[PDB]
Amino acid sequence: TEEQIAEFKEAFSLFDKDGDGTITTKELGTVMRSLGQNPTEAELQDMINEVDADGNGTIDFPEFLTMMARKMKDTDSEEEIREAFRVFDKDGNGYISAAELRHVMTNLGEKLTDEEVDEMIREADIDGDGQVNYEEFVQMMTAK
Amino acid sequence: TEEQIAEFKEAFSLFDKDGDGTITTKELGTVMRSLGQNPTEAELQDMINEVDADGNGTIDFPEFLTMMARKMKDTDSEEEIREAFRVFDKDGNGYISAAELRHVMTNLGEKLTDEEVDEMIREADIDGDGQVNYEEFVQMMTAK
Amino acid sequence: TEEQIAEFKEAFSLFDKDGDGTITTKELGTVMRSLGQNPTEAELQDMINEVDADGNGTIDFPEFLTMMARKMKDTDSEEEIREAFRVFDKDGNGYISAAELRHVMTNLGEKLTDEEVDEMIREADIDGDGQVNYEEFVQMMTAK
Amino acid sequence: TEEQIAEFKEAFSLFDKDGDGTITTKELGTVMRSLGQNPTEAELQDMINEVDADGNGTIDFPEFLTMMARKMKDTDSEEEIREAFRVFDKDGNGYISAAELRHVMTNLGEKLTDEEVDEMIREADIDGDGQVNYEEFVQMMTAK
Amino acid sequence: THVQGRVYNFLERPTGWKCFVYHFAVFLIVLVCLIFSVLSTIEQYAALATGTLFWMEIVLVVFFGTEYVVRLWSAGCRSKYVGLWGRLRFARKPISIIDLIVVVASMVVLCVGSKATSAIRGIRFLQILRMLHVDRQGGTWRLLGSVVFIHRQELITTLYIGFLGLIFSSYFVYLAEKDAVNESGRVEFGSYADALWWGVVTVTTIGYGDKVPQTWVGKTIASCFSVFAISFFALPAGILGSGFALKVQQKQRQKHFNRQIPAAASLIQTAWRCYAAENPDSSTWKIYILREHHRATIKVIRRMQYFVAKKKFQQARKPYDVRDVIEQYSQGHLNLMVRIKELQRRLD
Amino acid sequence: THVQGRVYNFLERPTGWKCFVYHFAVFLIVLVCLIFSVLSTIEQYAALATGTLFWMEIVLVVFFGTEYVVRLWSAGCRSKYVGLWGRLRFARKPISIIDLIVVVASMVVLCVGSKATSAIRGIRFLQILRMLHVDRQGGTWRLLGSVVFIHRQELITTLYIGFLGLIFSSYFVYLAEKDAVNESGRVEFGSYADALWWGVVTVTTIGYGDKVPQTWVGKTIASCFSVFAISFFALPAGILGSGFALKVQQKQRQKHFNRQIPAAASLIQTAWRCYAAENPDSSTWKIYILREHHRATIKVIRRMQYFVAKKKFQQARKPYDVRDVIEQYSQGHLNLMVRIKELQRRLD
Amino acid sequence: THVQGRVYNFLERPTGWKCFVYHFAVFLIVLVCLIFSVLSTIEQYAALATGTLFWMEIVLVVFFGTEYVVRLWSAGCRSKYVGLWGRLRFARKPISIIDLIVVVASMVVLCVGSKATSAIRGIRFLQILRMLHVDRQGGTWRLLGSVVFIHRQELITTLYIGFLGLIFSSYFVYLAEKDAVNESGRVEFGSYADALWWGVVTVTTIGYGDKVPQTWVGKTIASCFSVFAISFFALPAGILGSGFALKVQQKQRQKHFNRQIPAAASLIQTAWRCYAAENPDSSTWKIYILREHHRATIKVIRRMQYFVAKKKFQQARKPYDVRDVIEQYSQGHLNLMVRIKELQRRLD
Amino acid sequence: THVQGRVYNFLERPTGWKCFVYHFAVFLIVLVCLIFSVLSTIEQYAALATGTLFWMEIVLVVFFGTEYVVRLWSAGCRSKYVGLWGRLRFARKPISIIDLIVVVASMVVLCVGSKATSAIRGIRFLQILRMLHVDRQGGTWRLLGSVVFIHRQELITTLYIGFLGLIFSSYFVYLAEKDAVNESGRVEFGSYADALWWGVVTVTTIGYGDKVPQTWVGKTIASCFSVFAISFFALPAGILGSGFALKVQQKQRQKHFNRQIPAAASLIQTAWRCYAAENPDSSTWKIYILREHHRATIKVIRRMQYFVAKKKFQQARKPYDVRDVIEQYSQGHLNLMVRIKELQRRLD
């Protein structure tokens, strides 16, 4: 894990940019603004409150490594995403329409780039009446 | 329904006034101010949240056609109005006084024009001790 | 009751000071400021919301006469005041101390003039160990 | 208790600095600022609401003497502090680590001076695997 | 007309000591009816009895026929049933059928059944059917039906399981004891149906004592099964109990509402105005002061406001909710930040 | 005077181990009374018994007469009943009647009934009536009555239905079994009244076992009806249970209140000032510093503030509500937008 | 393919009068089955009976085998079980085992058991096992299990204590009465086990009446123990009752939720984008418009937002809470004081 | 030392399948004990039995003595009981007395009672006392006691009334039936005590069936009284049921708390600093950088902050409340209007 923690200290140094060892809401906002994002302050606070376990309001490096350690390909996270798919599922059979998914991904929430959706649709076997088994997506994106 | 949707696109064009296909709170407020109404912004938001089903905050044309499709002469809306009449009904027999209705319509809520109330009163058979069967009004205004 | 309603219209004219027939929060605040009182605006709104029954926010003359009609010497109001006395009653026997009442009336809530309290104390038979039966006060001030 | 109340009037005079007999949020804030503390106003209000029993918002001298009378070496306060220690106690056996306590006392809440923590640690018998019986601390600091 | 209205109100939704008492009184009279009718089989007094009883029955049925019809004509205040066809529809109500049948049954059976076995076998039926009217109020019956309908699932399940386990434990017991002979010489558990009866008698904590297992295996199963499933059996009582107490509590909160009034006035006037719109010549135009395009858009905005008031009114009836708080607070905060940009900008 | 107050408090609202224990002790003494009085019919000891029993009864009634009167005179602290007429009214309380009757009954029956059948038939009545005082606190009795009064509707309904179904199922059963003969040679279900008794015995899960149907039709109806309506019958227990637990919970929340204090002080001083107003010469004018018109308007404003405090105080007793939150927040927001227009305007 | 989907839905989650009624109908048919099968032992009709019964049984088992298999192949719409191995896994469900065993048992026992004692002793087993399918819905079973699992502690405790006290009081009674002889000449309480049975029979309000204590000491213990512990015994019924009614209430609140939608869309797109990140050549870069260090930091921020949406969504399902209110209000207030310093400063 | 800690934890607060199962296993062993000990009275096997039983009993008591002592020494991790005197105090716990008595009783009675009537009369006592340990967790017992203590009032009242009405209705019945003779020739209701027993047997839905009234007057009173007061009798079950379900619900809410942490840290450090204050030479002065008067005032402010944290922490444990919301909102609003005057003024 020494190359892993080497990369995690490397990435922590990209946020730190000094010898503090903590990451502030400003210290992340300038990084996000250097990408041309313009996040809100409460967006950054909601972002930062999901990482720390000390309550102080900044992300230390062990908090960074605990976040970077724990796995997306999880028992619970797969079921959360599967329960999230079921809102847009009529009849609950395990299939959603292709154009319904394109209308949702490009309109609702964070609106997707049409090239992103054109990749996302073609990631799954879409034919067979246009229905797609979203657990195929979940196994794909939970392959990690 | 093609003349109906022709009229609904005609009316949608009166709100759109460009090629957006969406109606904004401003885009309705200028129309209402052109009638000399001066609505509040939260009034417009409460108005607009009753039309859309996408949550985005504007009224697309299919939202316009779903609003314009569905009928006032309804099973539920008649019972809602009938339950609304019963607040001003003493003894609950199905009769309210004429002058009580004139005092309510010209004072409470949106105060009515006295000519409006003079039409509204004479819309129903008012004599017989001055009592009026408001289900006669409901059948009238649910004749659509 | 014609002399009563003559006096009530006379008193209503002291608040109206024009031909409105309604009393505004300003229209009462100027009257109270002419007495050197300086009430708050929310104080005036809490004052005015206890008089009207139309919800409009001003006191019409029938609201004035309904307020001026209904009696302080009541079944409920006597019991409310009697329950109010019991907070300062130790052992609940029906007696409070004289100096406890002077400390409360001149400190808590609206602080009383010492001449007011000197009248208030001597309104009741105070001797007999300094205890006073507050239902004697309640019968006195519910004699109306 | 006359030397006690002499000292308590002496200390009350240090807050009063006039002949009021009451202590204001300002009247305490200037004293705290003379020590170089800079407290918040709501901090002072939370401080002052724990002393008065009259609700007026200032601390009279009898409120000062009731606060200064009542004892820290209490039945309840010892159990409150003992329940407070158990958050940082793994396995609940009555022992916490030395470096865990140094990490908590210098980081969480009000961060302690390292000399304060160096005294605090050495106040208890710390060896025996580094564990410390916090009820020894509680008996110490509840010796009053 | 006013008197009939008062009378109908007095009969249907009466309050005060005399009215409820009036009904109580008629209940004492029907008591005396039963006293004399059952004393009719006592020979020391069968002479007095035979005189006051044949009389009493007719006195009752006559009086009731009267009060019934009085009720039905005086019931004209309700606009649904005002008028002739109105009373006919009015008759459509259940309790109408109820008192109808009671009085007509007594009528026919005392007109022909006087001079006869099934006649008396019906006269007891009548003494039964006549007492039905003692409650007479209908609103809360709905409450009951509601709560049941809400909890249909649980009840259904519990019943299923308990009844089932009954079935099973019955089987095992029957096989356990179908050979034993009671000390009185007979065999209790003749067939499985016997044991089944015994079961159901047991599982509900009745304990007649006519049928009791003998072999320790039997007693064992009885014990286990009883002690276990009995609680399941008594659950619907507990459930419904708590259900009512809860729903009652919430209702008791709902009592306080007032916002209904202006919302009502609004909703009303909105809808009327909307209807009045369909007339291009109506007076609602006097609001705006030729109107080639403003008509349609006006209809829109009018319908919109209507829907607002409608929903909002429905809310004007439902208890406050953390939802409402969260929403309105967030909004006011939003408006506020708006006004901040307004003055920030003004300073620009 | 202070001692009587302490004594009355000690008797009425006592706490600590000695007081409750004192009453416990007198309860042990009345136990010994019953032990000896019932041992009086045992001949090995009837000699000792006849000595300690005739004594014991009088010891009791004397002591109780004393404690009673002690209580009644020491009860002068309550202003209602202080004074002579006060004690007379005081006597107006129920438990006063209670201990009055107990002691006077024992008095008369042991003065004349000594030297006699209904006398002893009354002496058991006395041993019964004397134990009534063991609880002695009255506040919560109201709680009970409250909950009942709240739920009167449901209880009434449930009772109605269950009792009713009893009636009906009884009819069908009676017709079902009025022909069978018990194996012991008799006929169980002689008349409908028999079956009725049997029913009510059943429906409440008693199961005496004296009367049991024979034909499978009977057993059928019994089963169905029982299993169904029994739950309805036990519902009021469940209901009231949950009712108390709820109301208790809310009360337990109410414990915390403090805002009552200043609201009280206000309401008080308002009302007194209002009364003091009726005197034009009173000192309340010293507030304002000839007053030709200011008098009446002053009375108005004073009454107004009074009503405010009154209602508000009533609220100063009731738990917080989303209502309060919504209101006050909206208000503060309103005041705020006002102040925004104030500074917007100032910049104008 | 569409038809199979409709058919599976019709069988599994059906609604409307015909579907539920269809099942009701098959329940009437199995009733006729039982009627004729039990009429087969009545000799006046055993001729007709022997014809329609041997037939009926096979008609049933055949029809059921069919509906079963129809169900299993039409069940391909669920992606878990679509496909061959899918049906195999599908079979893994309990009720699959259920109807499997029912139909195969009837199959084997009517193929070989026709021409035989345990065969009929099994045929009753079959008439039992066939009725199991009448409910068929599985979601709420979880509800039951939940509530139990929540309250396991109390139930466990209550059961412990009651059962225990049973044990003890049994001991004392046995010692009390092991010497008495019933009036019928026998000794009721032979051994401690007898008394134990008697106990458990009592403590649960059954009251068979076969075993009753004789000496006043016995009656005493019985009384005390019964009256005391019985309430403890019936507690789990009450508990679970209130449990369901509560949980039902909360669920009934939960019905209203809508915020789930956008939170879902977000969470989805976040996670997909995160996965798409692992491809450096993916199109997600088109967001930003070479990227030597921005890659890793991007992965960070993306994961972050993902977690936000994830948790938040979980909240997008849970009822509002004073927690949410307090938090968001405090925040908005904070932002506000921030903006105040912003304009204070601007004026600087 | 670490191993003893793990072992004590394993015995006291164990989880996972093996541990709970371990205890389950010892429960199967004591089952085999009872099987063989009761088989000892069966002569076909009394030879094998006499060998494995005298052995088994000693095997048990030995093993238990061991596990007990193992527990007691390994229990040194708890600071209260660490050390010698600590174990002595530790012994002060109830369950310590429990297993102590069980093992010592078995010890003495199997050392001397081997070679004897009350010995076996005690050996059953032992088989009873040994099963007591099967639950072993103590936290929730408090929960029970709590709920009871809360509702003591109601329970007390209900019990009072029901028991009372029993008494009365018993009197009337006794007078009603003391003359009748059972059909079996005897007189059921010999004395009032008989009827009393009968009553209590009835009122609790047992229904033995040994004593049943005969005259319609009796049946009448029985019916009325039963049907009425029975519900009162079963109320405490319902009450406690709902009580637990409620309190459980609230606890289930409380699970979420986190604010306890910093409040704890604060409260801790406050109190320590306060104590450290009493030393004028302590390091806490390093905060301030001779101090003739600042000392005392410092002690004040320190104690103040301490109290704040203390109370606040207590709150850091209690669920949020509309109280908190109302307060903090009003405050923030106040601060806000303050800042408005701050900028209004600045513009001045």
Residue closest to C77 by CA, chosen among E256, F314, F304, F296 = F314
Whether residues H241 and G236 touch (CB distance < 8 A) is answered with yes
C-alpha distances out from residue E81 to B94, C136, E3, E141, E142, Å: 10, 58, 17, 22, 22
Which amino acid, H148? V
Q: How many CB atoms sit inside 10 A of residue G190's CB?
A: 11
Pure H helices in B38-133? 41-48, 61-69, 75-85, 98-105, 114-122
The DSSP code sequence of C34-101 is TTT----HHHHHHHHTTT-SSSSSS--HHHHHHHHHS-SS-HHHHHHHHHHHGGG-STTSSEEEHHHH
* Residue G4 half-sphere exposure toward CB, CA atoms < 13 A: 13
Contact A116 G286 (CB under 8 A): yes
- The CA distance from G232 to G169, in Å, is 15
Residue E148 · residue E113 · CB < 8 Å: no
Q: Are D13 and H306 in contact (CB under 8 A)?
A: no
Separation CA E342–CA E124 (nearest Å): 84
CA torsion sign for F168, F169, F172, F178 is negative
Question: What is the distance in angstroms between the CA of the first residue and the CA of the last residue of chain B?
Answer: 18
Helices (H), chain H: 2-12, 17-39, 46-74, 84-90, 94-112, 117-129, 141-150, 152-177, 192-203, 216-254, 260-277, 294-315, 322-347
Nearest CA-CA partner of E71 in E14, E28, E27: E14
**Would an 8 Å CB–CB cutoff place H179 in contact with chain G?**
no
In E, minimum Cα distance to B71 occurs at: E303
Phi-psi group of E320: left, alpha or beta (phi > 0 → left; psi -120 to 50 → alpha; rest → beta)? beta
A108 touching B, CB under 8 A? yes
Residue A133, SS3?
strand
H helix and E strand count, chain B? 8, 2
The closest alpha carbon to E69, from E128, E11, E129, E15, belongs to E11
Contact between D104 and H265 using a beta-carbon 8 Å cutoff = yes
The residue ranges of DSSP E strands in D4-135, in sequence order, are 95-97, 131-133
Rounded-to-integer distance, Cα F335 and Cα H21, Å: 66
Measure F312 CA to nearest chain G CA, in Å.
25
Distance CA E77, CA B94 (A): 8
Sign of the CA dihedral E210, E215, E218, E219? positive
- How far is the C-alpha of A88 from the C-alpha of A81, rounded, in Å? 12
Beta-bridge partner residues of C97: C131
Measure D24 CA to nearest chain A CA, in Å: 32
Across-strand partners of B131? B97
Contact between residue G191 and residue G165 where contact means Cβ atoms under 8 Å apart: no
For chain E, what is the HEC assignment? CHHHHHHHHHHHCCCCHHHHHHHHHHHHHHHHHHHHHHHCCCCCCHHHHHHHHHHHHHHHHHHHHHHHHHHHHHHHHCCCCCCHHHHHHHCCCHHHHHHHHHHHHHHHHHHHCCCCHHHHHHHHHHHHHHHHHHCCCCCCHHHHHHHHHHCHHHHHHHHHHHHHHHHHHHHHHHHHHCCCCCCCCCCCCCCHHHHHHHHHHHHCCCCCCCCCCCCHHHHHHHHHHHHHHHHHHHHHHHHHHHHHHHHHHHHHHHCCCCCHHHHHHHHHHHHHHHHHHCCCCCHHHHHCCCCCCHHHHHHHHHHHHHHHHHHHHHHCCCCCCHHHHHHHHHHHHHHHHHHHHHHHHHHC
Please state, in angstroms and rounded to a whole number, the distance separating the CA atoms of residues H76 and H71.
Answer: 9
For residue D96, list its beta bridge partners: D132
Burial class from Cβ neighbours inside 10 Å (0-12, 13-18, 19+) for residue G72 reads middle
Asked if the C-beta of C54 comes within 8 angstroms of chain B's C-beta atoms, the answer is: yes
Separation of CA F51 from chain center: 41
Chain A neighbors of B55, CB-CB under 8 A: 108
> Is residue F189 a contact partner of residue F252, using CB atoms and an 8 Å limit?
no
Are A122 and A73 a contacting pair, CB within 8 Å? Answer: no
Q: Which of G311, F63, H243, H305 is nearest to D44 (CA)?
A: H305
Token pair of B8, please?
């609904």
Sort out which chain D residues have CB atoms less than 8 A from C107's CB and list them: 54, 56
Run of H or E residues at D50: none
Of the candidates E143, E110, E13, the residue with the CA atom closest to the CA atom of residue E71: E13
For residue G155, the surrounding DSSP H or E stretch is: helix G152-177
β-strand B131-133 against A131-133: which pairing, if any? Answer: unpaired
Q: Neighbours of C (≥3 Cβ pairs closer than 8 A)?
A: B, D, F
Say whether domain A1-69 belongs to CATH 3.40.50.720. no
Task: Give Cα H220 to chain centroid, integer Å.
Answer: 43
Closest CA to F191 of F176, F210, F172, F178: F178
Hey, how many other C-beta atoms are within 10 angstroms of the C-beta on H207? 29
> Which residues in chain B are contacts of C54 at CB distance < 8 A?
107-108
Taking a C-beta distance cutoff of 8 angstroms, is the pair C87, C52 a contact?
no
Determine the residue of chain E that is closest to B118 in CA distance: E283
Contacts of F207 in chain G (CB under 8 A): 206-207
How far apart, in whole angstroms, are the C-alpha atoms of residue G152 and residue H321? 29
Taking the CA atoms of C54, C56, C57 and C63 in sequence, report the sign of the dihedral they define.
Answer: negative
Q: Which two tokens stand for residue H48?
A: 């094998």
Q: Which residue does chain D place closest to H257, by CA atoms?
A: D87
Q: How many CB pairs under 8 A join A and G?
A: 118
What tokens appear for H41 in the block?
A: 């009275």
Resolution number, Å? 3.5
Q: Which residues pair with A95 in a beta bridge?
A: A133
Whether chains C and A touch (3+ CB pairs under 8 A) is answered by no
Query: Which chains are adjacent to chain H, needing at least 3 Cβ pairs under 8 Å?
Result: D, E, F, G
From the list F246, F323, F336, the residue facing E245 with the nearest CB is: F246
Q: Is G155 exposed, middle or buried (0-12, 13-18, 19+ CB in 10 A)?
A: middle
CA-based nearest distance F342→chain H, Å: 9
Instruction: Determine if residue A130 is left, alpha or beta; phi over 0 gives left, psi from -120 to 50 gives alpha, anything else beta.
Output: left
**CB-CB neighbours of C90 under 10 Å:** 9
Secondary element (H or E) of residue G214? none
Q: Is D110 in Cβ contact with H266 (below 8 Å)? A: yes
C56, two tokens: 């409009």
**From CA D28, how far away is CA D46, in angstroms rounded?**
12
**What are the CA-CA distances from residue F77 to residues C85, C132, F136, F150, H306 (Å)?**
17, 12, 18, 35, 44
DSSP letter at F44 equals: T
Q: Buried b / exposed e across H216-228, counting CB within 10 Å, b at 16+? A: eebbebbbebbbe
Q: Are H340 and E336 in contact (CB under 8 A)?
A: no
- Select the residue of H207, H238, H241 nearest E207 (Cβ to Cβ): H207
The torsion angles phi and psi of A95, rounded to 5 degrees, stand at -145, 135
From chain A residues 1-60, the ones with a CB under 8 A of any chain G CB are 7, 10-11, 14-15, 28, 31-32, 35-36, 41-42, 45-47, 50-51
Q: Which two tokens stand for residue B144?
A: 């659509």
Sign of CA dihedral E291, E297, E303, E309: negative
Q: If you measure CA to CA, which chain C residue comes closest to B103?
A: C54
SS3 at position A122 = helix
- CA diameter of chain H: 111
Contact F8, F72 (CB under 8 A): no
Other beta carbons within 10 angstroms of residue D140's beta carbon come to: 13
H332 in contact with E at a CB cutoff of 8 Å? no
CA distance, residue A108 to nearest chain G CA (Å): 6
Q: From C56, which residue of chain B is nearest by alpha-carbon distance?
A: B108
Q: What is Dmax (Cα atoms) for chain C?
A: 58
Q: Are D82 and D135 in contact (CB under 8 A)?
A: yes
Instruction: At H274, list the tokens.
Output: 């306060």
DSSP state for residue B139 in the 8-state scheme: H
Contact C113 F286 (CB under 8 A): yes
E99, amino acid identity: D
Contact F346, H347 (CB under 8 A): yes
Contact H1 D113 (CB under 8 A): no
Query: Nearest Cβ partner of B119 from E269, E283, E335?
Result: E283
Q: How far is CA H64 from CA A130, H30, H35, H61, H113, in A?
A: 70, 11, 19, 5, 19
- Angle formed by the axes of helices C2-16 and C25-33, nearest 10°: 90
Alpha-carbon gap, residue A100 to A123, rounded angstroms: 16
Which DSSP category does G204 fall into? Answer: T
- Output the CA torsion C59→C65→C67→C71 (10° steps): 180
Q: After which residues is chain B broken (C to N over 2.5 A)?
A: none
E299–chain G nearest CA distance, Å: 30
Among the listed residues E205, E207, E181, E176, the one whose alpha carbon sits nearest the alpha carbon of residue E192: E176
Residue in E closest to H245 by C-alpha: E242
| H helical segments located in chain F | 2-12, 17-39, 46-74, 84-90, 94-112, 117-129, 141-150, 152-177, 192-203, 216-254, 260-277, 294-315, 322-347
Cα C13 to Cα C19: distance, rounded to the nearest angstrom: 9
Euclidean distance between CA atoms D143 and D73, whole angstroms: 6
3-state per-residue secondary structure call for G36-75: HHHHCCCCCCHHHHHHHHHHHHHHHHHHHHHHHHHHHHHH
Give strand pairing partners of A43.
none
Please state, as a whole number, how many other Cβ atoms lie within 10 Å of the Cβ of residue H87. 18
Which amino acid would we find at residue G6? R
Q: Write the CA distances from C96 to C92, C124, C143, integer angstroms.
A: 9, 12, 21
Residues ≥6 apart with Cβ < 8 Å to E344: G342, G343, G346
Residue B52: list chain A partners with CB under 8 A. Answer: none
On whether the CB atoms of residues H272 and D110 are closer than 8 A, the answer is no
CA gap D13, D17 in Å, rounded: 6
**Would you tell me the crossing angle of helices B25-33 and B41-48 to the nearest 10 degrees?**
120
- The structure's method of determination equals cryo-EM
For residue G14, give the 3-state DSSP assignment. Answer: coil
Residues 6+ apart with CB under 8 A from H150: F248, F252, H243
What is residue D133's DSSP assignment?
A: E
Residues 6+ away with beta carbon under 8 Å from E97:
E91
Give the bridge partners for E14, in sequence order.
none
Structure tokens at E318: 């439902």
**Selection from H225, E35, C120 nearest residue F204 by Cα:** H225
Task: Identify whether the C-beta of residue E217 lies closer than 8 Å to the C-beta of residue G221.
Answer: no
G240 burial level (CB within 10 Å; 0-12, 13-18, 19+) = buried
- Hey, what are G70's tokens? 């129809």
Is E41 exposed, middle or buried, given 0-12, 13-18 or 19+ CB atoms closer than 10 A? exposed
Q: How many CB atoms lie within 10 A of CB F320?
A: 19
Q: Does G157 contact H144 at a Cβ distance shorter than 8 Å?
A: yes
Give SS3 for G152.
helix
Query: Are C110 and F266 within 8 A, CB to CB?
Result: yes
Residues 6+ apart with CB under 8 A from G222: G169, G173, G202, G213
Cβ-contact G211, G126 below 8 angstroms: no
Q: Which residues of F are annotated as a binding site?
A: 137
Place of tokens 């018994």: F49
- The answer to whether D84 touches H264, Cβ cutoff 8 Å, is yes
- Name the minimum distance, in Å, from the CA of E171 to any CA of chain H: 26
DSSP-assigned letter for residue F198:
H
Contacts of F234 in chain E (CB under 8 A): 234, 237
